Amino acid sequence: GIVLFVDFDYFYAQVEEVLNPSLKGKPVVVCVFSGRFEDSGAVATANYEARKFGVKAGIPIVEAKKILPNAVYLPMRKEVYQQVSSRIMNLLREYSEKIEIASIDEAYLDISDKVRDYREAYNLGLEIKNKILEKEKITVTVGISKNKVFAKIAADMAKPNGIKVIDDEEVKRLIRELDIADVPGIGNITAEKLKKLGINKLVDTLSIEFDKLKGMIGEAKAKYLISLARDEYNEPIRTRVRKSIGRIVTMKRNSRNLEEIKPYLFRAIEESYYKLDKRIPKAIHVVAVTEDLDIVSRGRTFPHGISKETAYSESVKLLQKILEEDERKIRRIGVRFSKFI
DNA sequence: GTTGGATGGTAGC
DNA sequence: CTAACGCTACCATCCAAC
Ligand SMILES: Nc1nc2c(ncn2[C@H]2C[C@H](O)[C@@H](COP(=O)(O)OP(=O)(O)OP(=O)(O)O)O2)c(=O)[nH]1
Numbered sequence A: 001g002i003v004l005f006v007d008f009d010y011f012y013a014q015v016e017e018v019l020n021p022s023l024k025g026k027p028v029v030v031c032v033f034s035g036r037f038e039d040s041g042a043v044a045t046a047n048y049e050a051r052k053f054g055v056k057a058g059i060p061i062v063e064a065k066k067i068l069p070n071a072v073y074l075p076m077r078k079e080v081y082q083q084v085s086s087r088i089m090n091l092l093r094e095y096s097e098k099i100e101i102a103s104i105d106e107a108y109l110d111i112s113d114k115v116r117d118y119r120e121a122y123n124l125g126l127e128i129k130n131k132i133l134e135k136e137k138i139t140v141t142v143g144i145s146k147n148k149v150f151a152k153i154a155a156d157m158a159k160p161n162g163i164k165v166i167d168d169e170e171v172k173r174l175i176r177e178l179d180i181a182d183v184p185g186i187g188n189i190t191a192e193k194l195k196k197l198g199i200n201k202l203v204d205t206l207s208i209e210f211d212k213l214k215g216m217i218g219e220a221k222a223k224y225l226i227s228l229a230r231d232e233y234n235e236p237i238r239t240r241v242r243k244s245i246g247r248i249v250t251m252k253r254n255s256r257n258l259e260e261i262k263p264y265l266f267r268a269i270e271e272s273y274y275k276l277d278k279r280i281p282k283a284i285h286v287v288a289v290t291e292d293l294d295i296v297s298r299g300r301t302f303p304h305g306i307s308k309e310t311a312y313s314e315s316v317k318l319l320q321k322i323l324e325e326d327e328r329k330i331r332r333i334g335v336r337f338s339k340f341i
Numbered sequence B: 001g002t003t004g005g006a007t008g009g010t011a012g013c
Numbered sequence C: 001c002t003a004a005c006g007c008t009a010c011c012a013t014c015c016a017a018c
């Protein structure tokens, strides 16, 4: 079983250079404006020229404009990007029919049946790299290893424009040496209790017991981490099916005025039912984000699929239900559908 | 003495 | 208006219905 993995490089940004090569070699920042006020909102992504200064995805657009006044600030075009993804995802079907679209820029492959050893695998990722580059002008990063995790890890090591094989032997090696907070599945919070026990190596896990660990990080995590440490771990490729569909909007000013929030909410519902396209959901959750940016929500689940009209009326209740229990002014509000038939 | 649902915690794009 | 998008997936916890 050989698992190759691909993660496109500074994606949305790289796409924009493709369209506007006069940007090439000059820091670019891809923005999710929010119409609150001029330059309100956050950064989706930015290229490596920009990242050198500290402008990562996440940071507020006003921080970036502080840091990089003379850069190119661009409004995110998810739809344009989704196209370059889609196409690039169809190429990858030429190489393997066992393909698991992870994100918009990431897909795993099972090439195990297409090649025989990591050397032939290497050669594939190399052609795969050239395939995409010739047809879409996008550099990517290929990460190869025996299973999904380490593949995603082997790429995260090669980024950008890299290609990296992690073979059985190098795998023994990382379990011992790889810094725990670099494992896919580990955020800062979990990466913070891990030092609290002593587990800094992906293998350290094995020097602690079984329980207290889980009593600190949870059941799935213990049975995730320990398996990798004991290298028994193996996660299979499957085609992923979208389980939820949302839309959420920031309001021009914070409110508790139901007649003020309503039109914003009805926006989300409309654009949701389009983003649905034929999927009939049985569950709705109205999610609002509050002033202190704590995100809070209320949902309902129907024994049957919901019509557009149903969710119009049901969402209102839910918003009321939210107004009943949190007395804080709402800042962003949207809706979320799940449990499709 | 589970199964699911309602809310939220964490982690990654 | 005065900083913090928008999106998805998965697990942990808690309380009722069975
Ligand atoms: N709105 C928004 N978009 C994001 C966020 N994180 C990532 N994206 C978008 C922009 C990225 O190009 C794309 C994939 O995320 P990545 O982790 O791959 O960042 P990126 O690929 O641009 O860096 P790069 O490929 O790794 O060297 O999705 C985020 O927090 N918010």
Ligand SMILES: [Ca+2]
Pocket: A007, A103, A105, A106
């Ligand atoms: Ca990625």
Ligand SMILES: [Ca+2]
Pocket: A007, A008, A009, A010, A011, A105
């Ligand atoms: Ca990427």
Ligand SMILES: [Ca+2]
Pocket: A181, A182, A183, A186, A187, A188, A191
């Ligand atoms: Ca981490």
